[PDB]
Amino acid sequence: KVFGRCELAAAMKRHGLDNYRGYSLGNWVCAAKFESNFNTQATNRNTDGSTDYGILQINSRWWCNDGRTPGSRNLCNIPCSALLSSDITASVNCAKKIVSDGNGMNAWVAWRNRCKGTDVQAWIRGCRL
Numbered sequence: 001k002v003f004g005r006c007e008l009a010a011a012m013k014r015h016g017l018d019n020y021r022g023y024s025l026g027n028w029v030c031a032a033k034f035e036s037n038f039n040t041q042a043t044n045r046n047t048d049g050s051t052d053y054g055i056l057q058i059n060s061r062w063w064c065n066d067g068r069t070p071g072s073r074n075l076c077n078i079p080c081s082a083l084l085s086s087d088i089t090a091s092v093n094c095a096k097k098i099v100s101d102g103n104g105m106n107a108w109v110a111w112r113n114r115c116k117g118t119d120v121q122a123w124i125r126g127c128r129l
Contacts, residue, residue, distance in 0.1 A: 001039075001040050001041075001086030002038060002039050003032075003038040003040075003055075004038075005029060005033070005038065005123070005127070006124070006126060006127040006129075008029060008032055008038055008055075008088075009025060009028075009029050009123070009124050009127045009129060010127070010129050011088055012025060012028050012029065012032075012088070012092070013025060013129050015088065015089060015092040015093075016092075016096070017092065017095075017096075020096055020099065021096075021099045021100055021104060021105070022104075023099070023104070023105055024120060024121065025120075025123075025124055026120035026121045026122065026123040026124050027105060027111065027115060027120045029120075029123035029124060030111065030114065030115035030118070030120055030123045031056065031105070031108050031110065031111040031115060032055050032056060033123065034110040034111070034114045034115065035052075035055070035056060035057040035108060035109075035110045035111070036054065036055045036056070036057055038055065039055070040054055040055050040084055040085060040086055040088070040091075041054075041084050042054060042055065042057065042084075043084065044057065046059070048061070049061070049069055049070060050069040050072075051066060051068075051069065051080070053066075053080050053083040053084060053091075054083035054084050054085075054091045055083075055088060055091050056083070056091045056092075056094075056095050056108070057108065057110075058076070058080075058083050058091060058094050058095065058098070060072060060080055061073065062074075062075060063075050063076045063094050063097075063098065064076055064078050064079060064080035064082075064083055064094060065078075065079050065080060066079075066080040066081075075097060076093070076094035076097055078090060078094065
């Protein structure tokens with residue numbers, strides 16, 4: 001499922017991401033845009049073996065189980081395939097555990113590189129929520 005920008009922003013807000021750990025909505029929307037381009041089905045294979053899943057590109061070595069990444073830790077307790085769902089609850093739920101894991105949003109590389117320090121608010125423009 002490809003979300004629309006403001007449709008994703010609605011959904012994130014519902015789940016509690018607006019200002020969760022101190023990161024306003026627009027930081028989330030921006031992350032999902034550049035990590036996965038709003039596509040739930042997005043998967044990216046890393047040089048180390050592991051794979052990133054879904055709209056928030058959660059990694060298989062430490063958060064979810066794919067059965068194929070050596071040394072995996074599965075801290076969110078869930079199979080990686082449930083993060084490729086068109087409902088985002090499971091990715092949201094694992095993402096609140098990642099953001100509180102001592103690096104803030106810095107865990108997400110495309111957020112770091114495209115969204116940190118920017119005018120993020122800009123990603124809910126035109127949104128009614």
